[PDB]
């Protein structure tokens, strides 16, 4: 038991990773798994259940009209509307068309009812793609556009608001180094939607403000669990590895270096390791310097290559850094090296992928058709792994 469904795990430590000279944030959190069945391996993810900000919840109460003190059974033991809006209602994401049909049914204003049925309808698929999805309008924003849509409480949790999803995180710790704590490295998500809403990331803000048992015993806690991933180190340490996680994509790789370090003390020569890390600035964004210098100092990581998004005049990214070490990358690829990419899927991952096609031919001497197939074969061999979100 206790894998599919969550295990209450208090939060032991919660530390800010950036310097006070950084205008962003990134949180180091450790969940205390002592006394639980929870087990994890290097490269795994941890699912974390959180709750909505109180202000968000306050707004949902305003628009629904319910009594928060109303106890009802979410589809045992009942729950209040206020607690269900907090831990079980996805309030801030954009309503699906089926949710708009439900809303429309309880829209007592005929034009509000017509616009909703339209937005869900086929002849509305263009406007629904722009006004709702493109603009990143929440369920809460939509209901404010149609104050007449007053679905009953059953209908709301059954159809309008889907369940608050658990947020997944790459464990940044290895069991050998801390078999009693799950380490998560979590950047603070804080954006403005095209429609001008200011969105606090939901699990990220919880983590950024979680009270750790190392500073109080009312410490925070969250239902958590572990999902097995294929983002795994090679069985043989000797095998050469390439790691390409910048910014917050370092997290898996920190548990890669704890694994082979803990092994190395009792184990064999680890062979070549090269970690490509990128971040904005030396004096702000560099998360886990001293540990990384330590992993370099004691030979856990053979080499460490960094690019600076914005510190320098030149604005280096990691893929650019890869082009500089292209010939060497290719040698490790020919040597049997595994390559890991982790971090932002839409940009870094894509550009890192494109560099790879371009980089193989420099010594591959293959054209795009041939280079494409080669790098595709690395993926089906298991050689080339991507943990991107
Ligand atoms: C395998 C894996 C590993 C991960 N590892 C890490 C990690 O190590 N560190 C880390 O920080 N994160 C990691 N993430 C990302 C993490 O899972 C969450 O996606 C992230 O932390 C979001 O925080 P949040 O839940 O508060 O954000 P959410 O509230 O879910 O917001 C997420 C995004 O939704 C956007 N958004 C806001 N409103 C809307 C709307 N109406 N419609 C559509 N979009 C909207 C926001 O702009 C934001 O970019 C990982 C994800 C995966 C899948
Ligand atoms: N709140 C947020 O976290 C937030 C807000 C807006 C957008 N995003 C997007 O989502 C990503 C998540 O950020 P993070 O937590 O991984 O830290 P980050 O903010 O991405 O910083 C990591 C580093 O990646 C660099 N980078 C940006 N785009 C890249 C690309 N296409 N190829 C290679 N490197 C690139 C960044 O450079 P520069 O930043 O100097 O360009 C930065 O130096 C961001 O990179 C950004 O594109 C995130």
CA atoms within 13 A on the CB side of 168: 13
Pocket test for ligand 1, best of 30, 50, 141, 170 (most atoms within 8 A of CB): 170
Residues 44, 183, single domain; the answer is yes
What CATH number is given to the structural domain containing 308? 3.40.50.80
- Does residue 188 belong to any structural domain of this protein? yes
- Does residue 298 belong to any structural domain of this protein? yes
Q: Catalytic site residue 53?
A: no
Pocket test for ligand 1, best of 189, 205, 346 (most atoms within 8 A of CB): 189
Residues in the ligand 1 pocket, defined by CB under 6 Å: 45, 92-94, 136-138, 167-170, 185-187, 189, 191, 193, 199, 201-205, 248, 251, 387, 389
What CATH number is given to the structural domain containing 64? 1.20.990.10
Tally of residues, the chain: 389
Residues 19, 70, single domain; the answer is no
Catalytic residue among 94, 170, 220, 273: 170
What residue owns the CA closest to ligand 2's atom 4? 189
CA gap 285, 296 in Å, rounded = 19
- Does residue 245 belong to any structural domain of this protein? yes
What resolution in Å is listed for this PDB structure?
2.7
Residue 343 Cα: closest atom of ligand 2? 16
Domain finish residue from 111, 143, 160: 160
Domain finish residue from 134, 160, 186: 160
24 is in an annotated binding site: yes
What residue owns the CA closest to ligand 2's atom 5? 191
Q: Catalytic site residue 69?
A: no
351 is in an annotated binding site: yes
Residues in the ligand 2 pocket, defined by CB under 6 Å: 187, 189-191, 246-248, 278-280, 309-310, 317-319, 343-344, 347-348, 351
Residues 270, 377, single domain; the answer is yes
Residues 375, 246, single domain; the answer is yes
Residues 38, 60, single domain; the answer is no
Q: Catalytic site residue 387?
A: yes
Residues 93, 181, single domain; the answer is no
Residues 38, 185, single domain; the answer is yes
Q: How far apart are the first and last CA of the chain?
A: 28
Residues 300, 351, single domain; the answer is yes
- Does residue 233 belong to any structural domain of this protein? no
279 is in an annotated binding site: no
- Does residue 178 belong to any structural domain of this protein? yes
Residues 177, 280, single domain; the answer is no
What CATH number is given to the structural domain containing 36? 2.40.30.10
Residues 69, 149, single domain; the answer is yes
Q: What total number of domains does the chain contain?
A: 3
Residues 43, 185, single domain; the answer is yes
- Does residue 336 belong to any structural domain of this protein? yes
- Does residue 2 belong to any structural domain of this protein? no
Domain finish residue from 227, 253, 276: 227
Pocket test for ligand 2, best of 23, 191, 247 (most atoms within 8 A of CB): 247
Experimental method: X-ray
- Does residue 1 belong to any structural domain of this protein? no
Cβ contacts of 357 within 8 Å, gap of 6 or more: 368, 371, 372, 375
Ligand showing the shortest atom-to-Cα distance for residue 95: 1
Parent domain of 188: 7-50+168-227
- For 191, other C-beta atoms within 10 Å of its C-beta total 11
Residues 64, 41, single domain; the answer is no
């Amino acid at each position: 038991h206790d894998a599919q469904h969550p295990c209450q795990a208090n939060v032991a430590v919660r530390r800010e990773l950036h310097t006070p000279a950084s205008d962003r944030s990134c949180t180091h959190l450790e969940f205390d798994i002592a006394g639980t069945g929870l087990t994890y391996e290097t490269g795994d993810h941890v699912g974390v259940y959180t709750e909505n900000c109180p202000e968000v919840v306050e707004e949902a109460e305003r628009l629904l009209g319910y009594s928060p003190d109303t106890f009802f059974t979410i589809h045992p033991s009942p729950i209040t509307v206020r607690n269900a809006l907090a831990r079980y209602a996805d309030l801030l994401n954009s309503p699906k068309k089926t949710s708009l049909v439900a809303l429309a049914t309880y829209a007592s204003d005929p034009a509000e009812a017509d616009r909703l049925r339209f937005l869900a309808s086929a002849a509305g698929k263009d406007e629904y793609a722009q006004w709702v999805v493109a603009s990143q309008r929440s369920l809460l924003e939509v209901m404010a556009e149609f104050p007449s849509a007053k679905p009953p409480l059953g209908v709301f949790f059954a159809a309008v608001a889907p369940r608050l999803q658990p947020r997944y995180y790459s464990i940044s710790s290895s069991p050998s180094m801390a078999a009693t704590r799950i380490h998560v490295t979590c950047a603070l998500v804080h954006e403005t939607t095209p429609a001008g809403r200011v969105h606090k990331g939901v699990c990220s803000t919880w983590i950024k403000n979680a009270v750790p048992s190392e500073e109080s015993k009312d410490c925070s806690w969250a239902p958590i669990f572990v999902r097995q991933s294929n983002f795994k180190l090679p069985a043989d340490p000797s095998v050469p590895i390439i790691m390409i996680g910048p910014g917050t994509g370092l997290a898996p790789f920190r548990g890669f270096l704890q694994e082979r370090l803990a092994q190395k003390e009792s184990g064999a020569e680890l062979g070549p390791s090269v970690f490509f890390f990128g971040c904005r600035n030396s004096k702000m964004d560099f998360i886990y310097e001293d540990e990384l210098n330590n992993f370099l100092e004691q030979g856990a990581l053979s080499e460490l290559v960094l690019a600076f998004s914005r510190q320098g005049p030149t604005k280096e990214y990691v893929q650019h850094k890869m082009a500089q070490k292209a010939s060497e990358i290719w040698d490790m690829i020919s040597q049997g090296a595994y390559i890991y990419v982790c971090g932002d899927a839409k940009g870094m991952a894509r550009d890192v992928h494109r560099v790879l096609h371009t980089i193989v031919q420099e010594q591959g001497s293959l054209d795009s058709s041939k280079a494409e197939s080669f790098v595709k074969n690395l993926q089906m061999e298991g050689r080339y792994l991507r943990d991107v979100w």
